[PDB]
Symmetry: C7
Subunit: 280 residues, 7 copies
């Protein structure tokens, strides 16, 4: 062979070229493939890193982070190409794979919580437990909805204050809808002197509630002496009425009661402390 | 060989074609297989991405998310095909596998909590601890059930307000059924002047409870002086009666008591503060 | 060879059939094995998906979920067969393996909590800390046991209300048994005027407890002035008696005491507020 | 060759038997080895599944769970044998490995908490912070030990009520030993009229504590006016004495004090509310 | 061959050189490649470890940690090169890979929480729920924003005190914006003698609110007797007005009220305790 | 060949021995190596399982757990040897590896918490924030140190009660050292009649603190009227003094004050409730 | 061949040496390489285990743990060498790798929390939110900084007590700086008789604040009647002034006020309880 007398000495006279052509050429094929892969990945990364910016800038963005992210991802893709080259030549990169995988796991964990809100949003969207037009509470947070979307929900307070809350939080909690039900019960409590007649007061109260229309006479209308306290005996009342008027009626009756009790001669006592007196 | 004098020079005269036909053809078989795999996966992904939409739109859906998800999954399947190609040509994609696996782990973690509710629902369904017709409490949340399903349960409040709660939450908590048991005990407490006779009051109370039918005379009927306070000595009473009438009887007895005590001459005192008086 | 002049042209005249028969046949063996595996797995999955239903329907089930689960698992098994085929032809499915493994991890995490209750149940069963016939508390939840099983335990309340609680929860908590011990101590507190004689009261109390049989005279019977308050001086008492009668005796003594104190001339004072008086 | 003219046609006349005997026989060796492995594993699993029962039934067990577990583990071992067979023939089972590994991870997580108690038990055993004969508190749970073992510890309450608590819980908490120390301090508080002489009271108290033997005169004996309140001025006292008698002495001194103060003419006042009076 | 008679004895006369040239040379190629890789990685690490410092020192830094980190990362890169060498010679380093991967996982977990704040910052930035110029509360922390960035946010307190809070914390919480809404409601409560006329007071209050301009007459203006207390009957009032003036008006009205009530003859009573008097 | 006419028939006359000697012998080498590995591992495990006991029994141990652990680890090592054998013959044990790895992960998780205390101990040891001779608090747990070691720390209470707390717990918490600082401030509060002269009292207090030596006149000595209270006006005082005498001086001054105030004619009032009186 | 007639019988006459020289020599090369690796690793571990001690002892250390750690790490490195040997001979050690990796994961988890403090320290160092010279609070822990470093931070209390807190804890919390801002607002509250003139008091207060210089007349100076209270009507005041003098001025004004009010004839009332009197 011309291999090892022109470009090399006659090393053992053991001409390797024709004997091991495939072997010696395997390295070369590996090498060429590698470098080609490299350059193509490079140009691709450049193009794409600018292209994503091209597409995103139309949408709402910030420039600094846009640039930072595009450049960083570009660099990472590059790294990918590199490891592939190393693998082709026959180097052990499993360690590199391991470390980068650990990094991916760590970042996934870091963002997990945020991601959960995404999940929550999707879920509630398909389920539609409540809608923006509706008025509800999400647990300690009452007020009307304004909008609901990607990661957070937007609702207004009775005072008007706007509040925002993440989706992941709310789904975990319990939920209450008032809009979905038209009618609701109402409750009242009263306290009076022990002497006073329970029957008189009872029928009085009755006459009042009779007087009202908005009440649901169909539905029950309970009036009892609930329980006994230390200062006053305490009555309870129950009614049903449409959600819309619930508050108003709630106020109205109370005024009525006050007027009617004084007319009746009844009284609501003050805290009563009894004493025994001795001089010393 | 005709290999390296027509399409190539006489490179070492070492005709490789017949010598390494299998070797040189291995690349080609890899290549063709790869590209074929690619295109088939592509058309499949297209078809399926539209087909899932076809099937789902019949069901309740939102268009934006439907499109988003279908397109995204389509793209992902595509990616799968790509990596397979790279593998056939003989590139090291283990890093890619690692990163995508980390991503899958992260997303699974993010949605884990939601998924738990699914599990809870299935479990309770087969176990059937409670049923929609029944009235129960799930811990701080009393009211009647309305429905129970995929991830959440629906029940009504005594006031009527509708509430919803995730399944995963409830299973963790303790559970209480009232429907399942027909009868329940009841309790009462009373407070009186120290002077008053305990025997008189005792037999009085007794006579009352005797008077009632709904009480379970079979079952015990305890009446004791529970303990002594700072203002009044305090009695306790116990009874049993069917769940349905429990509340009513509870009210009835109290009225009786009030009437009977005044007849007896007994009195419930007010808070009593004793004093010693000196002028200065 | 007849290979490449009948079914093919004379491509390099390099007849491959006899030269590479094993090689060219390897693909075929792979292929046939694959498809065979496929079909067998398919029929198996069909049979088994119906068979599990056959077996389970005898037991308590719901039809919708039964069908859903059987079909889903059927489909999954199918998928298994598919990947095996792909592997035989020589495709890289490690990515698929990775993603499905991530999914399995996620679901395991989701159900982990529920599973913990299983573990708890098994544990308590072999340990037998308490038994259904017995009466205990599990921390804030007192009442008698009714039954204990797979994931949850069932006990009754003193009021009769039935309650259910998951096994995983209880094992974590502390546990208290009353049935296992026959006898228990009891405690009492008293408050009196500062003027009153401690020795008189002491011997009185003593005489009372002497009067009782159910008390364990063998065991200690402590009677001290525990400590001094702002309104009265406060005594304490201790006794021992069998669990069964514990409550009754507890009540009995108190009645005795009241009677005996008035006979003694002692008194339990009311809250005493001293004053100094000046006119302005 | 006799291969492909007797049992087969003259397919390409390319007699494969002698040419590829090793190759064609490799399949067979794989196959035979596989099936043999299968059957042996089967019989082994049967024997062992019954053998474990044989051994365990001697110990405390429940039959249902014993059977369930033995059968389940038997089945699992079987599955192992199966996958090995599949591997020998040359099928890709890595997916199966992955899923079963995910399952193992999930179950380990589920039982982790329980297992922690095991760890705790071992630890405390070698460390021996406290012993069964001793009396201690583990944080909110005071009472004497009864026994300590595998996963839980057993102690008695002062009232006698038996309580059980898991080992994992306690090790986490703080721990307090009374037995290990023979002597302890004691504290007292007092409140008196502002007018009264502090020196008189001081020396009085002193004389008392002098009177006692059980007190450790060697150790300090502090007596100060701790601080000033709104109703009275408040004294503090400190002493040391052996654990055993600690309670008794604590009571004794108090009686002494009461007697001695009345003799002294001192008094403990009641809550004093001053007033200004005007008529309207 | 000249192999084993010059440099070695005639070991079995089985000249290995020409027979196994490729085999024996494989080791050598491995070896040379390895060492070359080593040295290049070394020089690279040196250069880069200094280069990063060169670049970072321009930015705000601390020298000690800068040096520490640069040196440590340098060393780690070195380690990478080493394992690659070991792999080429044909040693099993999978254990090393495993341990270092476990370490990476641990560190990722340790820093996860901090990293979460990064995520939060990015998210809020693109979402822009609130802006620095605006005044808001983040839950228990009210005050005006100053700046928001990488991991933390900076806002000022009403008192002026500067406060800082991590981003990860806030995103989790609920959020409230006042700037975004121009107008808000306001509330008031009042308490008066039971005797006093509700109509008189009502119209008075009305006249006041009429008097004000800043109030939104368009919007509702509620005036009711909210509920009844133990000492005074209690009124409520509601209004709407721009955020900017909200506080001022809130104060103004109150002054008005005080003046007007005394003019009216109304009075706000003090806590009223009723008594019954007996001498003993 | 003599292979298949003596010990076998003339199967295809295709004598395999000389043709495939290496192949057929590979199995044998695998087999012999395997069994040898087995037996050696066995004897090793026996020896070592007894040897560890030999070494440990000298140290403090319990016999039951010693035996249990030694036997269990012995068995596990055995298992290792087994899997290696299976691997040599050419069986797929990756599943076994997976399951045992899952088990190791689970146990590591279970013991993690305990292990954390180890870490804490090491850390504090090198850091030496506090030392046994010193007196400190670790958050809600004040008292003097006794000893600190492997997993827990030991300190004494002021009352003398011994307490133990795990290391992992404390490091998490905040830490407070009193020994490390020689001097500390002190605070006092007072309340008096509004009429009384602030200047007189001020100079009085001043004269007192002047009277004391132990006070650090160098350091500030603040005396102000902190705030005006409800029943009385309230003064504050500040001083500095060595830790050792801090308590004593704190008491001393108070006595002084009491004496001096009565001399001054000042008084500390009682809670003052004003009234308005009307007969009905 | 001389192989199997001198050192062995004529086994099948199938001389293996020259036929399979490479094969039979492969074992040997594996073996020699292995043992060499072993011994070198051993000597290295010895040297290094002593060398680390040599280097560390200069720094602050404890001997027992130093020795323990050095020996343990030495042993572990040894183990590494061992597994490599086993791998070369061709044994399956993947199980060993798995278990040791699980152990590494467990230990990383155990120390994770501690490590987090490291991260926190680094972060705060580069960010420099606060500096040692400055005075701040970290949430419930106010006092001046002393030093900040590796894992913990050191600050002094107003009382002087030294406190230490881990870095990981603080970063999580919210942070407050007083040093960074020069000026701060101040607040005051007052309560007076309802009769008293608001205008008089208002202008009085005004005159006072006018009197002061340190106040920022530029900045607002609010004086309103905040709200009407129960026993008294309650005023509020606001001011701004430099941090340094904030406390002093805060005290000064109060003294002024007291003096000026008595001069004005105003009074701060005591709690006023009204009564109604009847004899029985």
């Amino acid at each position: 062979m011309e291999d090892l007398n022109v470009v090399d000495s006659i090393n053992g006279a053991g001409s390797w070229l024709v004997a091991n052509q495939a072997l010696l050429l395997s390295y070369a094929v590996n090498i060429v493939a590698a470098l080609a892969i490299i350059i193509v990945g490079l140009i691709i990364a450049r193009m794409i890193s600018n292209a994503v910016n091209r597409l995103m800038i139309s949408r709402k963005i910030d420039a600094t982070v846009a640039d930072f992210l595009s450049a960083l991802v570009r660099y990472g893709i590059i790294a990918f190409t590199l490891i592939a080259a190393l693998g082709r030549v026959g180097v052990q990169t499993a360690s590199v794979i391991a470390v980068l995988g650990a990094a991916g796991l760590a970042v996934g964990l870091a963002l997990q919580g945020s991601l959960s809100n995404l999940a929550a949003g999707v879920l509630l969207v398909m389920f539609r437990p409540f809608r923006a037009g509706e008025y509800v509470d999400l647990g300690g947070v009452a007020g009307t909805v304004l909008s609901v979307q990607i990661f957070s929900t937007t609702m207004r307070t009775a005072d008007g204050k706007i509040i925002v809350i993440p989706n992941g939080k709310i789904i975990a909690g319990n939920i209450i809808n008032f809009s979905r039900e038209p009618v609701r019960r109402n409750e009242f409590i009263i306290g009076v002197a022990y002497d006073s007649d329970i029957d008189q007061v009872k029928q009085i109260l009755t006459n009042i509630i009779q007087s009202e229309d908005r009440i649901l006479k169909d539905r029950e209308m309970t009036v009892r002496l609930n329980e006994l306290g230390a200062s006053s005996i305490n009555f309870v009342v129950r009614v049903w009425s449409n959600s819309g008027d619930l508050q108003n009626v709630y106020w109205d009756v109370l005024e009525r009661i006050k007027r009617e009790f004084d007319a009746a001669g009844i009284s609501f006592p003050y805290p009563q402390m009894d004493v025994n007196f001795k001089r010393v």
